[PDB]
Design an enzyme around this catalytic site. Structure first.
Site, PDB file in Angstrom:
ATOM      1  N   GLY A 189      -4.643  -0.153   9.094  1.00 32.19           N
ATOM      2  CA  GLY A 189      -3.294   0.370   9.279  1.00 32.19           C
ATOM      3  C   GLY A 189      -2.700   0.066  10.642  1.00 32.19           C
ATOM      4  N   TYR A 221       2.455  11.340  17.128  1.00 26.37           N
ATOM      5  CA  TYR A 221       1.591  12.089  18.029  1.00 26.37           C
ATOM      6  C   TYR A 221       2.389  13.240  18.559  1.00 26.37           C
ATOM      7  CZ  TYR A 221      -1.256   7.894  17.810  1.00 26.37           C
ATOM      8  OH  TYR A 221      -2.026   6.861  17.317  1.00 26.37           O
ATOM      9  N   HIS A 223      -5.417   1.335  29.049  1.00 26.26           N
ATOM     10  CA  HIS A 223      -4.569   2.467  29.405  1.00 26.26           C
ATOM     11  C   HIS A 223      -5.226   3.778  28.970  1.00 26.26           C
ATOM     12  CE1 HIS A 223      -3.383   0.786  25.630  1.00 26.26           C
ATOM     13  NE2 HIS A 223      -3.036   2.009  25.214  1.00 26.26           N
ATOM     14  N   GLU A 253      -5.929  -1.882  22.787  1.00 26.07           N
ATOM     15  CA  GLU A 253      -5.587  -1.752  21.381  1.00 26.07           C
ATOM     16  C   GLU A 253      -6.646  -2.395  20.493  1.00 26.07           C
ATOM     17  OE1 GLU A 253      -3.046   0.347  20.433  1.00 26.07           O
ATOM     18  OE2 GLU A 253      -3.235   0.507  22.617  1.00 26.07           O
ATOM     19  N   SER A 278       4.238   5.464  17.547  1.00 27.28           N
ATOM     20  CA  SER A 278       3.614   4.225  17.971  1.00 27.28           C
ATOM     21  C   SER A 278       3.119   3.344  16.812  1.00 27.28           C
ATOM     22  CB  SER A 278       2.493   4.505  18.980  1.00 27.28           C
ATOM     23  OG  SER A 278       1.359   5.126  18.401  1.00 27.28           O
ATOM     24  N   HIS A 322      -8.676   2.746  26.918  1.00 25.45           N
ATOM     25  CA  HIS A 322      -8.888   1.853  25.799  1.00 25.45           C
ATOM     26  C   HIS A 322      -7.910   0.693  25.797  1.00 25.45           C
ATOM     27  CE1 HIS A 322      -5.486   4.262  24.301  1.00 25.45           C
ATOM     28  NE2 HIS A 322      -5.189   3.160  23.639  1.00 25.45           N
TER      29      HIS A 322
HETATM   30 ZN   LIG Z   1      -3.178   2.671  23.051  1.00 28.56          ZN
END
Ligand SMILES: [Zn+2]
Ligand SMILES: O=c1[nH]cnc2c(-n3cc(CCN4CCC(c5cc(Cl)cc(Cl)c5)CC4)cn3)nccc12
Ligand SMILES: [Zn+2]
Length: 342
Positions: free
Chosen positions: A158, A165, A264, A178, A276, A176
């Site tokens: 996905g 959020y 980030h 992406e 997001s 982390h």
């Molecule tokens: Zn992120």
């Protein structure tokens, strides 16, 4: 290497004309060297709004709220998730705003940031994270998270769907990059700010070595343990070990863009809602082919074959034979940025 040599987080203020083409504007911000920081802020023009009002979402369900339990000391922390049963925005907002969970009194961000790092292990908050959905009205064509129109759309049966959020004070996202080291867009729909820490992609490996040294157990168990999004490292700890980083606070109505291999982390100032999704440009293809993935979880893995056959036809047989020894330059902007570089 001349553009944004400092690799500091850049802020953009596009006009309505500039803003109408998402993929083109990303190519523009890259020609300005925005990618070097690993994170950028895009403030949209005053006239643009993705939804008329947010007064109709009290009965919106948060399927899996997560209570965030943090264990740690001296700038190093591990965050453990506890899935709670489904709750509505109305119930989440009541909890977020209550005396127990509300934002502490502060005069400046530096003070709120100090309160965060001092208290992140106490009174675990609840994060209304990873809600499949969008708050964009169907007619919105500019920067619609649901339908960006980037080259990531090639993944058609996905990472291509939007997520919501709902934050509260002290809720956090661990260091982390992406999934598949893709790009990401984050729109803060409403509420209190969200503060971000960024490590320039050219220094990403420096951070990984620091994280590997501090958590040797987790490092052996998984080739890319930071992908588990459980590791919290304070700016002071980064300073103590020479990891170059920058910080920025995102406010309601502002976008944040994360770039491939841009590490980030951050936290919410209080009750808010961010939307997001992930996205791609031609530059990401090489990052996806070279991405170190989480080996301990059966995770988000994209097949790169379709991307290589379409955008690197000459490289297909070489890459598939395992002979592609391409060394990624993190400072180099996306090929699409050429029109802004001439
Ligand atoms: Zn992120
Ligand atoms: O504010 C955030 N809250 C939660 N997660 C954030 C984040 N990421 C979350 C993911 C996990 C996405 N995956 C699908 C679940 C990746 N980045 N990146 C940036 C910001 C946030
Ligand atoms: Zn893993």
């Amino acid at each position: 290497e001349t553009l944004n040599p400092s690799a500091r987080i850049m802020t953009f203020y596009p006009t309505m004309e500039e803003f109408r083409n998402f993929s083109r504007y990303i190519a523009y911000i890259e020609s300005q060297g925005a990618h070097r920081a690993g994170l950028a802020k895009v403030v949209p023009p005053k006239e643009w709004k993705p939804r008329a009002s947010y007064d109709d979402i009290d009965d919106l369900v948060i399927p899996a709220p997560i209570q965030q339990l943090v264990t740690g000391q001296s700038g190093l922390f591990t965050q453990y998730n506890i899935q709670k049963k489904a709750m509505t925005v109305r119930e989440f907002r009541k909890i977020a705003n209550s005396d127990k969970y509300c934002t502490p009194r502060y005069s400046e961000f530096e003070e709120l940031e100090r309160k965060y790092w001092k208290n992140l292990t106490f009174n675990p908050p609840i994060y209304g994270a990873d809600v499949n959905g969008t708050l964009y009205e169907k007619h919105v064509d500019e920067w619609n998270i649901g339908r960006l129109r980037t080259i990531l759309d090639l993944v058609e049966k996905g990472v291509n769907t939007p997520y919501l959020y709902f934050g509260m004070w002290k809720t956090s996202f661990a260091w982390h990059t992406e999934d598949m080291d893709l790009y990401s867009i984050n729109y803060l729909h409403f509420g209190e700010p969200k503060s971000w820490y960024s490590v320039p992609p050219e220094h990403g490996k420096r951070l990984e070595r620091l994280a590997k040294g501090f958590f040797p157990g987790s490092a052996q168990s998984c080739e890319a343990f930071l992908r588990h999004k459980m590791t919290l490292i304070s700016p002071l700890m980064l300073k103590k070990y020479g990891i170059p980083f920058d910080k920025v606070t995102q406010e309601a109505g502002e976008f944040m863009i994360t770039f491939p291999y841009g590490y980030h982390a951050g936290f919410n100032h209080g009750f808010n809602c961010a939307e997001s999704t992930n996205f791609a440009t031609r530059r990401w293809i090489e990052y996806g082919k070279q991405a170190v993935l989480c080996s301990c979880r059966k995770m988000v893995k994209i097949s790169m074959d379709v991307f290589v056959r379409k955008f690197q036809p000459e490289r297909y047989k070489l890459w598939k034979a395992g002979k592609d020894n391409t060394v990624i330059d993190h400072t180099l902007p996306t090929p699409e940025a050429a029109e802004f570089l001439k």
